Amino acid sequence: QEPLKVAFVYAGPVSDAGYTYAHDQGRLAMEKNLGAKVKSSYVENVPEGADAERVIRKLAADGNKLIFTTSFGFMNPTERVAKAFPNVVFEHATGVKLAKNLGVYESRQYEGTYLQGVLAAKMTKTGVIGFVGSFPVPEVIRNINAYTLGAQSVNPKIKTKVIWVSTWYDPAKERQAAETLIAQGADVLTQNTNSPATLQVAQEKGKYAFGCDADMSKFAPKAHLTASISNWGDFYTKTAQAVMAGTWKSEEVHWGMAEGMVKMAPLNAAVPPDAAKLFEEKKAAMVSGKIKPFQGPLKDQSGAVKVAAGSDLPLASLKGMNWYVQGVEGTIPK
Ligand SMILES: Nc1nc2[nH]cnc2c(=O)[nH]1
């Protein structure tokens, strides 16, 4: 068989050392695993809307038979190109739109974020943890709520302050947002943006933060408590193999810590032994499915019950999550 032409569309740069870096490490793992059977290429820094549609269409027109579109913002462009290219397989990250030649895939990174919350509660001195958000889409709201629930499993009085930058990647805006969270009393920060900017600010101010999608400890060795690492390579390999073998079908795929898509970086030396022990126990329980981030009981911020004790939040509620747990608030606007 001719080598399978595979293309990756990134919303950011491979030099983000975060989200796009991790997707690109997955492409390179697919190339290592499948060798001469695959020929990969990529496009970085692709904007949303008309630009994304033009890039995706050009890759399909040039003979790519499998195209990964790695941003939420590529959802509608991917759906429109997939209709025009019925002999090409499309895989869209974090989306909810499917077709005969369009699948969707995502990680359960919120499993990792829950464990970051457990550690944040152990390491905070203010009792206020902070979150740099991109856009209020379900991926990000699940991470905000999981961070908060993980912290509240240690200290039920924890408060989570959220600031929004309306971008997935802008190191200058991310830095400003991290400065504002620390000014408003957050002392352990996480994010759903894509740069190490928040970590660099945390180190400058003597605060803590987490790496996102990759180990970011080299950017901020004193501030980096751990990181929720995204391993896409096994998924990209499996998908490329399926297309080559004629077994591919449209489905919604979500992998977490049990499937190896989500891993934690080693703990910072500053984490005391009581905190490290709890973290390792909760990590083992998360991998085994003994605990789930959205196990009941859960209430929203209006006091409405979302999940009773002894139940887990349903898949439909996870997929569309647009509500907050008690203790989530915004920053005062600058
Ligand atoms: N985490 C995350 N980062 C992104 N960067 C650009 N698009 C995305 C996305 O959908 N999710």
Residue numbers in the entry: 27 to 360
The article reads:
Here, we describe the characterization of the periplasmic binding protein AtzT, including high-resolution ‘closed’ structures with bound ligands. Primers were designed to amplify the gene sequence without the sequence encoding the TAT signal in order to facilitate heterologous expression. The X-ray crystallographic analysis shows that AtzT is a two-domain protein, with each domain containing a central β-sheet of 6–7 strands, with 2–3 α-helices on either side of this central β-sheet and a C-terminal extension of about 45 residues. After identifying the unknown compound binding to AtzT as guanine (using a combination of X-ray crystallography, mass-spectrometric analysis and SPR) and searching sequence databases for the sequences of homologous proteins, we believe that AtzT is a purine-binding protein that can accept 2-hydroxyatrazine (and possibly atrazine) from the environment when it is present and guanine is absent. The structure of AtzT allows us to classify this protein into cluster B of the solute-binding proteins.
Between the two domains we find the binding site, in which clear density (>10σ) was seen for an unknown compound in both the original 1.87 Å resolution SAD structure and the subsequent 1.67 Å resolution native structure. Mass-spectrometric analysis allowed us to determine that the compound had a mass of 151 Da, and fragmentation analysis of this compound led us to believe that the compound was guanine. Guanine was placed into the electron density, where it refined well, and the resulting hydrogen-bond pattern to the binding-site residues satisfied every N and O atom of guanine. The guanine ring is packed between (sandwiched by) Tyr45 and Trp194. Every possible heteroatom of the guanine appears to engage with the protein. Additionally, the Asn218 forms a hydrogen-bond network with Asn169, which is oriented within hydrogen-bonding distance of the Glu165 backbone carbonyl.
